[PDB]
Design a protein around this ligand. Sequence first.
Ligand SMILES: Cc1nn(-c2nc3ccccc3[nH]2)c(O)c1C(c1ccccn1)c1c(C)nn(-c2nc3ccccc3[nH]2)c1O
Ligand SMILES: Cc1nn(-c2nc3ccccc3[nH]2)c(O)c1C(c1ccccn1)c1c(C)nn(-c2nc3ccccc3[nH]2)c1O
Ligand SMILES: [Zn+2]
Ligand SMILES: [Zn+2]
Lengths: 324, 335
Amino acid sequence: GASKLRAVLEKLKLSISTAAGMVKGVVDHLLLRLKCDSAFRGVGLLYEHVKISAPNEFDVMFKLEVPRIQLEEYSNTRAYYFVKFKENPLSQFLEGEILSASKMLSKFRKIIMKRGSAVTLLIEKISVDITLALESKSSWPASTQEGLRIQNWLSAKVRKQLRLKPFYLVPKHAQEETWRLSFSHIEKEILNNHGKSKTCCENKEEKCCRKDCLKLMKYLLEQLKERFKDKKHLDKFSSYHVKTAFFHVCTQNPQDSQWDRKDLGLCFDNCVTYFLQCLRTEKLENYFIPEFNLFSSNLIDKRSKEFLTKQIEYERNNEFPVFD
Amino acid sequence: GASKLRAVLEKLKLDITAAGMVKGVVDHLLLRLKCDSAFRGVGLLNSYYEHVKISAPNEFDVMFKLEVPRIQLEEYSNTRAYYFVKFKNPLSQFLEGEILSASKMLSKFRKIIKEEINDVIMKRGSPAVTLLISEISVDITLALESKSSWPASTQEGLRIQNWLSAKVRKQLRLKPFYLVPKHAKQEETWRLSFSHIEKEILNNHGKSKTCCENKEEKCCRKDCLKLMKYLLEQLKERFKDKKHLDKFSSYHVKTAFFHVCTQNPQDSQWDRKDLGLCFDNCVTYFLQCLRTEKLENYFIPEFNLFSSNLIDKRSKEFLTKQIEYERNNEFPVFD
Ligand SMILES: Cc1nn(-c2nc3ccccc3[nH]2)c(O)c1C(c1ccccn1)c1c(C)nn(-c2nc3ccccc3[nH]2)c1O
Ligand SMILES: Cc1nn(-c2nc3ccccc3[nH]2)c(O)c1C(c1ccccn1)c1c(C)nn(-c2nc3ccccc3[nH]2)c1O
Ligand SMILES: [Zn+2]
Ligand SMILES: [Zn+2]
């Protein structure tokens, strides 16, 4: 039954660098204007399409390095932090000793169109969501110590090299002045360098279906969210849950031969299965922050997960009619 | 006879505390050099110390790097490896016309180091300075760092695509390259250096990313390289009172080994069980390079390390005879 999945992927691919050229013009302009300011002088780039079905909705991130940062964990949430400082161009945005996300974002929007993580620009069909992020080159927070468990797949050496890279903090409510950990750069680097073999997907002998499986999962969730957009059951699910579950599946299946392209049908099915399991048991560990449960009852209620479970099982039993 | 090979490797493994002493000197030198405007951005390539000889644990090798932004290279004759350094300036005090003088820069480098050393002893281009700590030796090399694109002479080198992948080769070529002062057969030229890339490929050396991180994936690449280098070191020692082997170096061994890695890209061609054959096939390849007088620089394909203009055929024939004898008699020089 994988032929239908292949048809779906063909249609998704036929739907580019033009629109991105327009977006690039606008983003370079905005970054120059921001760089003229004392507080955002170090602003910089770390295009991405959050929804695979929306080729004209872009997502970019403006970073800003914060040297010698001091993090205060909010409420043992493992993912949300106050940003204190350990000579400070962000002093304009302090509320006591904490960097205020409110003031910083207010000024950021000022320099920058439409309304945490911060601005939606139009450039008649193209939309661009811009998120502000602090960059830190300090070691990763202690809540990540047991995350990114790629040692049996991409290797312990790669894990060390990745953990030597910066981490990011985006403004997000937990209490209004908290910042949330972001590792989207690591997710991207893994997705584009995803095999146990370094030449994975560089030759016919070593073609795998990891990326295709992820795209099919994201498209399944997007189609289901669209179809039931009039109900509220699926409003809290996002491609972040899909990507986290996909990375967990990659950890469970670390060999390239478990992702042979010929087995797309099974591989995708496996992905679906794991996601469904996560829904039923209400457990989806953040891939980088293992004590953060994205499927906690404090975040998504039981009924929403049961509804998504039923809809997905229906789709799989009927060869995914929502793909059409 | 692979058991003897593994015995040799065991003995080579069995103090490197010594580095401590090395570090103590190195840091201090770097402190002093950083007070000068010309050497303001000096640092360690980074690992403070390396060893060019597997059998000289007290003989260390250090590279001090210094970034030259907006560098302009001009290739000497068509050497493909040697260049004059010009600029597109804290180094303007060493400028002879429009070209950076290796002689003046080196003179100042060693002057500063000598004055700092006096507060260790100094021995009199590339290993700019040799310091003897206590009774421990440290060869220090000055290198310019350029973060611009690699020179055009390297465009078809580093052919690791079928071994370490094309993505890895692109990432490696995005790293800086280095220029070490070195005279050419002309005394104000600089020679390309990629020893950082060499270290990276040796310590991340398999097609599989988990090569040598578990029992199922142990390969014998590093052991074959160690055995080749020990073979050369022992042969150069045994015949050091003749000049026949003075021009051969661990660089030749390493270059030939990397070529063999390109020829045998699969981890299953380096299974630890097959150490004996793998090493043999390394020796053979090196031998081939000696007979045909051809050993392309792994990063600069048109620079022939075994050219008749660099090493004459008498030396290559002597080394071939010695190596073939050793291989036919189960390597008694290892003892
Ligand atoms: C990925 C992502 N898909 N996505 C999405 N998928 C859709 C599918 C159909 C229709 C609409 C859709 N919208 C979305 O809205 C995000 C955002 C995001 C995208 C861009 C900018 C900001 N946010 C995000 C979220 C919802 N959660 N999240 C996150 N939760 C965390 C918890 C702990 C630690 C880190 C965390 N990161 C995150 O990054
Ligand atoms: C000679 C040498 N050419 N070379 C080189 N030639 C090039 C030609 C074109 C492009 C790049 C090139 N790089 C190089 O990088 C060295 C180094 C070295 C190191 C530090 C400073 C200067 N050169 C070295 C090594 C790698 N081994 N080695 C050595 N092996 C020994 C074994 C036994 C006994 C003594 C030994 N000495 C040694 O001298
Ligand atoms: Zn692949
Ligand atoms: Zn190995």
